[PDB]
Amino acid sequence: FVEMVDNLRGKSGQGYYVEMTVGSPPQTLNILVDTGSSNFAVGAAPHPFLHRYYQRQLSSTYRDLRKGVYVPYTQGKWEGELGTDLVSIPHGPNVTVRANIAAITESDKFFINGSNWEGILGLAYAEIARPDDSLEPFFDSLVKQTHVPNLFSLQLCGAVLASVGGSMIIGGIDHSLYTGSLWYTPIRREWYYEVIIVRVEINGQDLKMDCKEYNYDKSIVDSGTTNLRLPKKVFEAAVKSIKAASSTEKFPDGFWLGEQLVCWQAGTTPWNIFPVISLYLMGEVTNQSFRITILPQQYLRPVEDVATSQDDCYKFAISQSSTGTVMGAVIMEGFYVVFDRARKRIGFAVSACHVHDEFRTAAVEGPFVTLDMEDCGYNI
Numbered sequence: 001f002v003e004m005v006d007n008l009r010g011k012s013g014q015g016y017y018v019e020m021t022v023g024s025p026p027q028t029l030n031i032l033v034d035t036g037s038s039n040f041a042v043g044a045a046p047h048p049f050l051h052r053y054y055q056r057q058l059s060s061t062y063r064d065l066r067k068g069v070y071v072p073y074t075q076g077k078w079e080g081e082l083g084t085d086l087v088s089i090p091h092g093p094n095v096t097v098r099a100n101i102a103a104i105t106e107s108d109k110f111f112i113n114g115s116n117w118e119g120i121l122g123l124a125y126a127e128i129a130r131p132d133d134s135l136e137p138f139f140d141s142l143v144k145q146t147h148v149p150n151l152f153s154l155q156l157c158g159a160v161l162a163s164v165g166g167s168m169i170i171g172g173i174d175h176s177l178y179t180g181s182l183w184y185t186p187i188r189r190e191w192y193y194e195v196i197i198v199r200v201e202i203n204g205q206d207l208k209m210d211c212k213e214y215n216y217d218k219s220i221v222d223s224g225t226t227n228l229r230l231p232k233k234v235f236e237a238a239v240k241s242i243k244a245a246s247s248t249e250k251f252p253d254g255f256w257l258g259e260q261l262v263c264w265q266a267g268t269t270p271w272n273i274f275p276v277i278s279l280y281l282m283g284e285v286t287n288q289s290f291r292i293t294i295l296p297q298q299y300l301r302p303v304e305d306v307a308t309s310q311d312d313c314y315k316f317a318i319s320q321s322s323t324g325t326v327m328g329a330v331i332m333e334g335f336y337v338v339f340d341r342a343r344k345r346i347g348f349a350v351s352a353c354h355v356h357d358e359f360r361t362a363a364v365e366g367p368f369v370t371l372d373m374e375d376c377g378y379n380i
């Protein structure tokens with residue numbers, strides 16, 4: 001799968017995008033890779049932030065579905081016109097498929113001013129597709145219409161704004177992207193990429209919460225979220241433990257709440273006063289788990305557009321959630337992540353490109369013995 005290595009680009013905090021073509025003749029667009037949604041949606045009008053946009057009038061293969069879709073998020077929104085067209089991934093498999101495309105015709109706080117992407121590729125399942133689960137997601141079309149295997153994998157490599165990169169391997173796994181073994185956790189249900197966290201440690205120290213709290217109301221793997229988001233109760237306990245572990249220096253309450261940055265002189269960041277965070281995930285076998293471990297390099301993130309400071313400033317990128325745990329870029333940048341849809345499981349291995357120091361490294365380890373893991377899942 002050497003053709004697909006290094007097919008992702010981006011800037012810090014603006015997501016990871018892949019090049020795609022839409023229509024005949026092909027119109028090239030940069031598309032955000034998003035495991036946390038299920039619509040393929042592209043700018044179709046000259047919004048001032050966009051480098052380019054889908055021009056349906058130039059495509060002979062365009063077909064109108066004569067139906068609109070309105071998609072509000074918690075803080076942004078877009079509205080679009082549904083159709084189908086021929087879609088390819090130049091640095092992906094040598095195939096072309098007819099996919100649903102939402103042509104975005106109105107938006108608010110969706111596109112990023114200064115970003116280099118013009119659309120989103122929702123790689124999750126039909127259950128959370130808008131307007132409903134009858135709108136077949138891109139990856140489902142790809143698999144149905146071709147011989148590409150029903151899996152993909154992601155290596156997200158973290159860094160005026162630093163450039164990020166990585167690989168999306170479509171239909172396979174590239175062993176050059178990881179070291180050690182892959183460890184798999186079940187996809188609990190095919191909507192989001194829902195997983196179950198069974199234990200949490202800060203520097204080896206169990207938080208000791210009822211594990212249901214770790215997954216209330218769900219835990220997902222989401223390449224379209226920057227942070228590690230945690231349920232409120234879990235965030236409260238997690239911060240309490242991280243504060244204690246890093247108490248040799250003090251920081252204001254707002255830093256922990258993500259309401260202000262913290263800065264240090266160039267090259268003087270105290271990585272070592274910050275603890276590692278380990279998430280144990282449900283394993284493949286009854287009573288068996290494995291653990292993934294990330295560093296402060298992952299959850300303490302450089303902000304490189306602070307014009308009013310000359311120092312190295314960082315954002316605390318663990319945050320409280322009302323929608324459950326979100327394993328965003330903070331988690332994924334440590335690991336090679338295999339979305340093994342064929343076997344309803346997600347694989348983690350140490351990423352060959354993860355950012356670390358001479359003392360500590362990201363880890364994937366098992367097996368561990370963990371009882372009552374089925375009790376960790378939330379039901380209504």
Ligand SMILES: C#CCOc1cnc(C(=O)Nc2cc(F)c(F)c([C@@]3(C)N=C(N)S[C@@]4(COC)C[C@H]43)c2)cn1
Binds near residue numbers: 015110223
């Ligand atoms: C680089 C880097 C660090 O990682 C990321 C990942 N994603 C982003 C990002 O901008 N994601 C993004 C932006 C949106 F405007 C946006 F609407 C979304 C959506 C479609 N997808 C998500 N997974 S979060 C979301 C609500 O959940 C559906 C806001 C929706 C993601 C930025 N940095």
